[PDB]
Amino acid sequence: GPLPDAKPLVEEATAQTKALKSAHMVLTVNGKIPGLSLKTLSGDLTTNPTAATGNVKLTLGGSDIDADFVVFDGILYATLTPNQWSDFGPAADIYDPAQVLNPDTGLANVLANFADAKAEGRDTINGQNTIRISGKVSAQAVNQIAPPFNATQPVPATVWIQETGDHQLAQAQLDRGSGNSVQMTLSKWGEKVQVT
């Protein structure tokens, strides 16, 4: 029926997100974001210390590639060919996965810079009730979490936050105009992350 006020909900999600250590994430890009090859990714992230494992589909020379990836001890590895691990050097020289959960420049920072918050509706995300919430994320906050986005103005955005319970950020979308966008879904907050 009636929707909660978006502002307090965002502020709560911000606090909860700052305390996050680990999560499963699914990330997709709709349309085209110039300079970003990635199309989809699914994986598990933990921090302090940083480690990540998952799969990614990206374009590497006009071909679509499915690779498994691991970030461990600061290094990125991926299977560019089946069951064959390649070492691509320091993950940070491509993208440090812990960025997403960095309390100062990751999802928590997006939330803290999410302006004009307005509750729009309710949606199920991964079997949970969430409030869909519209607003605008600052260019700087966007560029810090997602450099290839190259924001030059506030970015229209939608976040879905758990209506009840821990009020976690379930999903976020950044709209780059047209049907070009990036979206990420978070689940399994606090899961123990494998061992590469």
mmCIF file of C-alpha atoms in Angstrom:
data_model
loop_
_atom_site.group_PDB
_atom_site.id
_atom_site.type_symbol
_atom_site.label_atom_id
_atom_site.label_comp_id
_atom_site.label_asym_id
_atom_site.label_seq_id
_atom_site.Cartn_x
_atom_site.Cartn_y
_atom_site.Cartn_z
ATOM 1 C CA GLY A 1 0.000 0.000 0.000
ATOM 2 C CA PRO A 2 1.705 3.183 1.305
ATOM 3 C CA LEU A 3 5.459 3.594 0.780
ATOM 4 C CA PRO A 4 8.001 4.472 3.504
ATOM 5 C CA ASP A 5 9.905 7.779 3.250
ATOM 6 C CA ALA A 6 12.896 7.188 0.979
ATOM 7 C CA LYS A 7 15.421 9.428 2.777
ATOM 8 C CA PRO A 8 15.577 7.568 6.118
ATOM 9 C CA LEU A 9 15.597 4.292 4.218
ATOM 10 C CA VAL A 10 18.579 5.365 2.107
ATOM 11 C CA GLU A 11 20.373 6.629 5.199
ATOM 12 C CA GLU A 12 19.834 3.281 6.891
ATOM 13 C CA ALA A 13 21.017 1.344 3.811
ATOM 14 C CA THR A 14 24.080 3.591 3.759
ATOM 15 C CA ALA A 15 25.025 2.637 7.350
ATOM 16 C CA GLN A 16 24.387 -1.067 6.725
ATOM 17 C CA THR A 17 26.386 -0.984 3.500
ATOM 18 C CA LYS A 18 29.399 0.588 5.276
ATOM 19 C CA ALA A 19 29.516 -2.426 7.621
ATOM 20 C CA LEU A 20 29.456 -4.970 4.799
ATOM 21 C CA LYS A 21 32.417 -7.369 4.588
ATOM 22 C CA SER A 22 31.247 -9.699 1.814
ATOM 23 C CA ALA A 23 28.462 -10.369 -0.695
ATOM 24 C CA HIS A 24 27.489 -12.129 -3.888
ATOM 25 C CA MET A 25 27.061 -9.685 -6.782
ATOM 26 C CA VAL A 26 25.601 -9.827 -10.241
ATOM 27 C CA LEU A 27 26.455 -6.992 -12.614
ATOM 28 C CA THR A 28 25.189 -6.340 -16.113
ATOM 29 C CA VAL A 29 25.584 -3.597 -18.683
ATOM 30 C CA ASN A 30 22.614 -2.789 -20.945
ATOM 31 C CA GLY A 31 23.412 -1.207 -24.318
ATOM 32 C CA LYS A 32 26.863 0.323 -24.657
ATOM 33 C CA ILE A 33 29.046 2.340 -22.319
ATOM 34 C CA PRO A 34 32.003 3.598 -24.422
ATOM 35 C CA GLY A 35 35.226 2.167 -23.015
ATOM 36 C CA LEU A 36 33.592 -0.573 -20.956
ATOM 37 C CA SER A 37 33.877 -4.015 -22.552
ATOM 38 C CA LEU A 38 32.151 -5.975 -19.791
ATOM 39 C CA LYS A 39 28.694 -7.350 -20.519
ATOM 40 C CA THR A 40 27.835 -9.501 -17.499
ATOM 41 C CA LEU A 41 29.535 -10.717 -14.334
ATOM 42 C CA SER A 42 28.522 -12.885 -11.397
ATOM 43 C CA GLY A 43 30.717 -13.571 -8.402
ATOM 44 C CA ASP A 44 31.484 -13.508 -4.711
ATOM 45 C CA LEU A 45 33.419 -10.772 -3.008
ATOM 46 C CA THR A 46 35.002 -10.520 0.386
ATOM 47 C CA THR A 47 37.126 -7.755 1.882
ATOM 48 C CA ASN A 48 39.639 -7.259 4.683
ATOM 49 C CA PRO A 49 41.288 -9.061 3.119
ATOM 50 C CA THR A 50 40.151 -8.775 -0.502
ATOM 51 C CA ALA A 51 39.353 -11.893 -2.504
ATOM 52 C CA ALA A 52 36.918 -12.543 -5.376
ATOM 53 C CA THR A 53 35.775 -15.431 -7.576
ATOM 54 C CA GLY A 54 33.164 -15.636 -10.302
ATOM 55 C CA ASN A 55 32.512 -15.557 -14.016
ATOM 56 C CA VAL A 56 32.548 -12.719 -16.472
ATOM 57 C CA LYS A 57 31.372 -12.282 -20.037
ATOM 58 C CA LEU A 58 33.259 -9.508 -21.828
ATOM 59 C CA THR A 59 34.357 -8.401 -25.278
ATOM 60 C CA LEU A 60 38.076 -8.722 -25.936
ATOM 61 C CA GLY A 61 38.778 -7.875 -29.571
ATOM 62 C CA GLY A 62 35.248 -7.983 -30.947
ATOM 63 C CA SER A 63 34.589 -11.477 -29.616
ATOM 64 C CA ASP A 64 32.394 -12.400 -26.668
ATOM 65 C CA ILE A 65 34.438 -14.267 -24.026
ATOM 66 C CA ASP A 66 33.187 -16.226 -21.031
ATOM 67 C CA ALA A 67 35.930 -16.453 -18.415
ATOM 68 C CA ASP A 68 36.114 -17.568 -14.813
ATOM 69 C CA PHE A 69 38.075 -15.142 -12.653
ATOM 70 C CA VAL A 70 39.780 -15.010 -9.261
ATOM 71 C CA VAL A 71 41.317 -12.109 -7.361
ATOM 72 C CA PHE A 72 43.649 -13.308 -4.653
ATOM 73 C CA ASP A 73 46.554 -11.600 -2.919
ATOM 74 C CA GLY A 74 46.118 -8.496 -5.064
ATOM 75 C CA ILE A 75 46.383 -10.446 -8.321
ATOM 76 C CA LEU A 76 43.812 -11.094 -11.051
ATOM 77 C CA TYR A 77 43.583 -14.499 -12.750
ATOM 78 C CA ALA A 78 41.127 -15.580 -15.445
ATOM 79 C CA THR A 79 40.455 -18.501 -17.738
ATOM 80 C CA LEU A 80 40.559 -16.957 -21.194
ATOM 81 C CA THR A 81 40.510 -20.513 -22.510
ATOM 82 C CA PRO A 82 38.682 -23.303 -20.661
ATOM 83 C CA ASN A 83 40.369 -24.605 -17.507
ATOM 84 C CA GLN A 84 43.473 -22.557 -18.338
ATOM 85 C CA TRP A 85 44.394 -19.925 -15.745
ATOM 86 C CA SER A 86 46.222 -16.791 -16.872
ATOM 87 C CA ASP A 87 47.796 -14.241 -14.535
ATOM 88 C CA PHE A 88 46.924 -10.660 -15.484
ATOM 89 C CA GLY A 89 48.941 -8.946 -12.799
ATOM 90 C CA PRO A 90 47.738 -6.642 -9.979
ATOM 91 C CA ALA A 91 43.928 -6.485 -10.016
ATOM 92 C CA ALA A 92 44.106 -2.806 -9.088
ATOM 93 C CA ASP A 93 45.632 -1.989 -12.493
ATOM 94 C CA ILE A 94 42.369 -3.154 -14.058
ATOM 95 C CA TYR A 95 39.753 -2.774 -11.295
ATOM 96 C CA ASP A 96 40.185 -3.496 -7.583
ATOM 97 C CA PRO A 97 37.049 -5.501 -6.731
ATOM 98 C CA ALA A 98 37.118 -4.276 -3.095
ATOM 99 C CA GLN A 99 36.243 -0.882 -4.536
ATOM 100 C CA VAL A 100 32.610 -1.932 -4.658
ATOM 101 C CA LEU A 101 32.487 -2.432 -0.887
ATOM 102 C CA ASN A 102 34.827 0.390 0.057
ATOM 103 C CA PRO A 103 32.842 2.383 2.635
ATOM 104 C CA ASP A 104 34.201 5.674 1.263
ATOM 105 C CA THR A 105 34.177 5.158 -2.520
ATOM 106 C CA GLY A 106 31.995 2.102 -3.103
ATOM 107 C CA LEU A 107 28.277 1.375 -2.887
ATOM 108 C CA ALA A 108 28.064 3.172 0.448
ATOM 109 C CA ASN A 109 29.368 6.356 -1.248
ATOM 110 C CA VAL A 110 26.872 6.042 -4.085
ATOM 111 C CA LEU A 111 24.124 5.860 -1.471
ATOM 112 C CA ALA A 112 25.526 8.819 0.485
ATOM 113 C CA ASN A 113 25.516 10.852 -2.753
ATOM 114 C CA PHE A 114 22.105 9.721 -3.910
ATOM 115 C CA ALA A 115 19.991 12.903 -4.181
ATOM 116 C CA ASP A 116 16.250 13.556 -4.600
ATOM 117 C CA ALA A 117 15.417 10.146 -3.123
ATOM 118 C CA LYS A 118 11.757 9.276 -3.857
ATOM 119 C CA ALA A 119 10.035 5.962 -3.147
ATOM 120 C CA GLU A 120 8.464 4.790 -6.395
ATOM 121 C CA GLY A 121 7.115 1.322 -5.605
ATOM 122 C CA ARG A 122 7.783 -2.186 -4.304
ATOM 123 C CA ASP A 123 9.589 -5.021 -6.076
ATOM 124 C CA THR A 124 10.744 -8.531 -5.212
ATOM 125 C CA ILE A 125 14.530 -8.967 -5.552
ATOM 126 C CA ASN A 126 15.781 -12.526 -4.913
ATOM 127 C CA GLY A 127 12.641 -13.422 -2.975
ATOM 128 C CA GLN A 128 12.713 -10.339 -0.747
ATOM 129 C CA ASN A 129 10.407 -7.319 -0.582
ATOM 130 C CA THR A 130 12.188 -4.094 -1.488
ATOM 131 C CA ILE A 131 11.339 -0.448 -2.005
ATOM 132 C CA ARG A 132 12.173 0.849 -5.477
ATOM 133 C CA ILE A 133 13.575 4.340 -5.100
ATOM 134 C CA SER A 134 14.490 6.950 -7.745
ATOM 135 C CA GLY A 135 17.112 9.698 -7.490
ATOM 136 C CA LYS A 136 20.327 11.081 -8.862
ATOM 137 C CA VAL A 137 23.849 10.070 -8.039
ATOM 138 C CA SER A 138 26.657 12.655 -8.178
ATOM 139 C CA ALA A 139 29.041 12.416 -11.084
ATOM 140 C CA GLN A 140 32.004 12.080 -8.756
ATOM 141 C CA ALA A 141 30.506 9.192 -6.773
ATOM 142 C CA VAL A 142 29.654 7.426 -10.027
ATOM 143 C CA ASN A 143 33.120 7.870 -11.503
ATOM 144 C CA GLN A 144 34.783 6.591 -8.360
ATOM 145 C CA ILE A 145 32.914 3.275 -8.371
ATOM 146 C CA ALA A 146 32.733 2.995 -12.125
ATOM 147 C CA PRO A 147 35.437 5.100 -13.897
ATOM 148 C CA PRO A 148 34.523 4.120 -17.505
ATOM 149 C CA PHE A 149 31.094 5.651 -16.862
ATOM 150 C CA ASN A 150 32.646 9.113 -17.286
ATOM 151 C CA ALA A 151 29.755 10.998 -15.655
ATOM 152 C CA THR A 152 29.703 14.733 -16.306
ATOM 153 C CA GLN A 153 26.518 15.568 -14.394
ATOM 154 C CA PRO A 154 24.264 13.893 -11.784
ATOM 155 C CA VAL A 155 23.271 10.412 -12.920
ATOM 156 C CA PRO A 156 19.668 9.258 -12.844
ATOM 157 C CA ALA A 157 19.552 6.136 -10.695
ATOM 158 C CA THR A 158 17.270 3.582 -9.076
ATOM 159 C CA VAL A 159 18.070 1.617 -5.926
ATOM 160 C CA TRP A 160 16.051 -1.143 -4.322
ATOM 161 C CA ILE A 161 16.447 -1.404 -0.562
ATOM 162 C CA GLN A 162 15.094 -4.136 1.746
ATOM 163 C CA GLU A 163 11.780 -2.890 3.143
ATOM 164 C CA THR A 164 12.261 -4.810 6.405
ATOM 165 C CA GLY A 165 15.021 -6.577 8.329
ATOM 166 C CA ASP A 166 18.561 -5.290 7.818
ATOM 167 C CA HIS A 167 17.564 -2.767 5.124
ATOM 168 C CA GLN A 168 20.430 -3.832 2.817
ATOM 169 C CA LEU A 169 20.962 -2.453 -0.700
ATOM 170 C CA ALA A 170 19.522 -5.209 -2.919
ATOM 171 C CA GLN A 171 19.960 -3.595 -6.323
ATOM 172 C CA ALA A 172 21.190 -0.394 -7.980
ATOM 173 C CA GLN A 173 21.019 0.953 -11.512
ATOM 174 C CA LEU A 174 22.770 3.905 -13.118
ATOM 175 C CA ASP A 175 21.226 5.249 -16.292
ATOM 176 C CA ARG A 176 23.611 6.724 -18.870
ATOM 177 C CA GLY A 177 20.871 7.922 -21.216
ATOM 178 C CA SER A 178 19.116 6.095 -24.033
ATOM 179 C CA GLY A 179 18.937 2.438 -23.038
ATOM 180 C CA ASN A 180 22.558 2.439 -21.866
ATOM 181 C CA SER A 181 22.954 1.452 -18.222
ATOM 182 C CA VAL A 182 24.807 -0.538 -15.621
ATOM 183 C CA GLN A 183 23.034 -2.464 -12.898
ATOM 184 C CA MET A 184 24.201 -4.562 -9.955
ATOM 185 C CA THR A 185 22.325 -6.902 -7.601
ATOM 186 C CA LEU A 186 23.732 -7.768 -4.182
ATOM 187 C CA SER A 187 22.806 -10.887 -2.194
ATOM 188 C CA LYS A 188 24.155 -13.182 0.510
ATOM 189 C CA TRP A 189 25.598 -10.327 2.614
ATOM 190 C CA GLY A 190 28.285 -11.783 4.890
ATOM 191 C CA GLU A 191 28.814 -15.076 3.102
ATOM 192 C CA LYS A 192 32.173 -16.735 3.649
ATOM 193 C CA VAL A 193 34.084 -16.403 0.444
ATOM 194 C CA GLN A 194 35.859 -19.491 -0.824
ATOM 195 C CA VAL A 195 39.552 -19.800 -1.273
ATOM 196 C CA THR A 196 40.138 -19.172 -4.931
#
